[PDB]
Each structure stands twice: as C-alpha cells, then as structure tokens.
Ligand SMILES: CO[C@@H]1[C@@H](n2cc(-c3ccc(Cl)c(F)c3F)nn2)[C@@H](O)[C@@H](CO)O[C@@H]1Cc1cn([C@@H]2CCOC[C@@H]2F)nn1
C-alpha cells in the first residue's frame with residue numbers, strides 16, 4: 218500500500234496491449250477519485266469519478282492541453298461505492314483507452330493525445346486507500 222497522491226512511472230510511455238491495474242479501497246465518505254495519464258504538463262486522459270456532482274454520481278473524462286481542459290465525456294454508469302475495494306483496469310488499445318472496473322467494462326476514451334510513447338506518468342489521487350499500481354503486457 219501507498220499514500221496518495223502517487224505517480225506510477227510509465228517509461229517510454231504507453232503502448233497497445235499494456236494493461237494497467239489499480240487496486241484500492243474507496244474512503245467511507247468519498248467525493249472524488251482521479252487517474253491522470255500525463256504527457257509532461259498535458260493530461261492525455263483524466264478519469265474522474267465524482268460521487269456528489271449536483272447530488273449525482275458521474276464519471277467525467279477529459280484531456281488537458283496547454284493547461285486548458287477540453288471537451289468532457291460523461292458517463293452515468295458508476296461502479297464505485299464508498300468504503301468498498303475496487304479494481305480499475307486501463308487497457309491501452311491502438312485508438313483508445315479501455316476502462317474496466319471490478320472486471321466489468323466501463324468506457325472507452327479515444328486518444329486525443331497521439332504520442333502514446335510520451336505518456337510517461339500515471340497520477341493517482343482522490344479519496345482512496347491505494348493498495349497496488351502495476352502494469353503488464355497481455
Ligand atoms: C475542479 O477541476 C476539475 C478538474 N480537476 C479535478 C482535479 C482533481 C484534483 C485532485 C484530486 Cl484528489 C482529484 F480527485 C481531482 F479530480 N483536478 N482538476 C477536472 O476534473 C476537469 C475535467 O474536465 O474538470 C474540472 C476543471 C474544469 C472543467 N472545465 C470545463 C467544464 C465544461 O467542459 C469544458 C471544461 F472541461 N473547466 N475547468
């Protein structure tokens with residue numbers, strides 16, 4: 218286990234067939250979780266479960282370029298629960314990131330940042346206890 222926030226290094230960036238597994242437990246009174254796939258200051262893929270946005274639960278995904286947030290992709294399917302252990306898996310595919318939570322497909326996010334080999338850090342933050350952060354090639 219590690220104390221958030223934590224940066225998982227991704228040397229030489231990501232590549233198709235790379236499967237990243239984040240294990241943790243959501244804190245009892247959680248407001249938000251965030252994964253940030255970074256290319257320097259740019260955020261290629263921000264995955265942001267929000268427990269209480271306008272008294273609703275929503276997943277927000279976005280890209281940050283030149284310090285500006287772009288078009289949000291939103292999803293009401295919300296597999297997380299306060300207090301509960303989770304597994305987030307991010308499969309890097311040629312054209313998108315594929316996200317599954319607790320072995321169930323959640324969403325796909327098309328690559329806006331094209332230089333996968335430059336996406337060299339994964340930031341993990343928010344209202345979680347982080348157990349594990351690792352990757353393998355499938
Ligand atoms: C509050 O900041 C968030 C941002 N955010 C969230 C965090 C974070 C920090 C720490 C922890 Cl522990 C953690 F969980 C975190 F989510 N940091 N930055 C991010 O979620 C962003 C996703 O679009 O939305 C907000 C920023 C934002 C969005 N937009 C518009 C909205 C209309 O559409 C076009 C633009 F997107 N303008 N600014």
Ligand SMILES: [Cl-]
Pocket residue numbers: 221222341342343344
């Ligand atoms: Cl944090």
